[PDB]
Design a protein around this nucleic acid. Structure first.
Lengths: 122, 116
RNA sequence: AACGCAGCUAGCUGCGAGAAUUAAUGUGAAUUGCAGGACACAUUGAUCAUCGACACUU
RNA sequence: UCGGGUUCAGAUCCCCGAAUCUUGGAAAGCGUCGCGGUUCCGGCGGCGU
């Protein structure tokens, strides 16, 4: 009788909307009870039924996303909301490949004259 | 050239063909029929309208227009609407007077919601 | 910045039509002004905290 | 887009009826004279305009 998130995750899309629809229907009836004379037990049901709306709607929104993630997993261009957000500045920095890029002149330099370990007797 | 003025020639303009959609998925319609109707109204003056005018009174979302209200009530309670009159209450809620078709009656219908 | 969101809610606070919060993880029997709702507590769960998933009206 | 009714609080917005000298129009409305009913009938008639 209690709607729980993890049991809804494996459930198919079509009846999730069916599950969403009636819960909205009961929510409408509860609002009708509020404006009229309403039992306290009835007036307790809006909050729980409202949270199930969020619980169900979270599932579909959570369910809908990763198909788009795996759909765009290997593609060159991704939708803006699927790209990493981080910070605006941190998205402008050079990727890890470029900051490791080094010129021909330096490469000859470091191979010819590597930094050595040494000790001095005293 | 039969005219002394030089006009910018019209050039080809290509329709945009994005390499990727900027939005991953369409935004969900967050203002639906259940959002159209908030709750029916039960004040003393209201009751007069259901009896003498075959009209239902509703508190609706402030962003809904008369067309949106009419479609929502029809599919929510399986009735027909003749006309809808709306006003914005001083408290900021939108009140809609929805008049049913002559063949339907507001008495038996308003029993189905439980308001009447 | 505005406007809304609580069963009873004006301010403060929190939140954004999934609106004094959804999911997940940790924790492990409460919240509390009243009522109601809860609560095998693993055939797995109240509250709180964390917070990486989702959502985020003008 | 006007006429008549309608609320405790809204009417050129609601309801009815018409639209964008005569039809409208007397059925309405308004004056009076009565009969019912007494939180029910918001029901009836008689004259006159």
């Amino acid at each position: 009788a209690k709607i729980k998130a993890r049991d809804l995750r494996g459930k198919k899309k079509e009846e999730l909307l069916k599950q969403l629809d009636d819960l909205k229907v009961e929510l409408s009836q509860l609002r009708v009870a509020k404006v009229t004379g309403g039992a306290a037990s009835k007036l307790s049901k809006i909050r729980v039924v409202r949270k199930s709306i969020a619980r169900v709607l979270t599932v579909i929104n959570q369910t809908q996303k990763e198909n788009l993630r795996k759909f765009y997993k290997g593609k060159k261009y991704k939708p803006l909301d699927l790209r990493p957000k981080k910070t605006r500045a941190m998205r402008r920095r050079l990727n890890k490949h470029e900051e490791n890029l080094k010129t021909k002149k330096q490469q000859r330099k470091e191979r010819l004259y590597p930094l050595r370990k040494y000790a001095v007797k005293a | 050239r039969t005219s002394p003025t030089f006009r910018r020639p019209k050039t080809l303009r290509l329709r945009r063909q994005p390499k990727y959609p900027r939005k991953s998925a369409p935004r969900r319609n967050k203002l639906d029929h259940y959002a159209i109707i908030k709750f029916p109204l039960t004040t003393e003056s209201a009751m007069k309208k259901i009896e003498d005018n075959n009209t239902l009174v509703f508190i609706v979302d402030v962003k809904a227009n008369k067309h949106q209200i009419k479609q929502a009530v029809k599919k929510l309670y399986d009735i027909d609407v003749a006309k809808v009159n709306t006003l914005i209450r001083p408290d900021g809620e939108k009140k809609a007077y929805v008049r049913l078709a002559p063949d339907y009656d507001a008495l038996d219908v308003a029993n189905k919601i439980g308001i009447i």
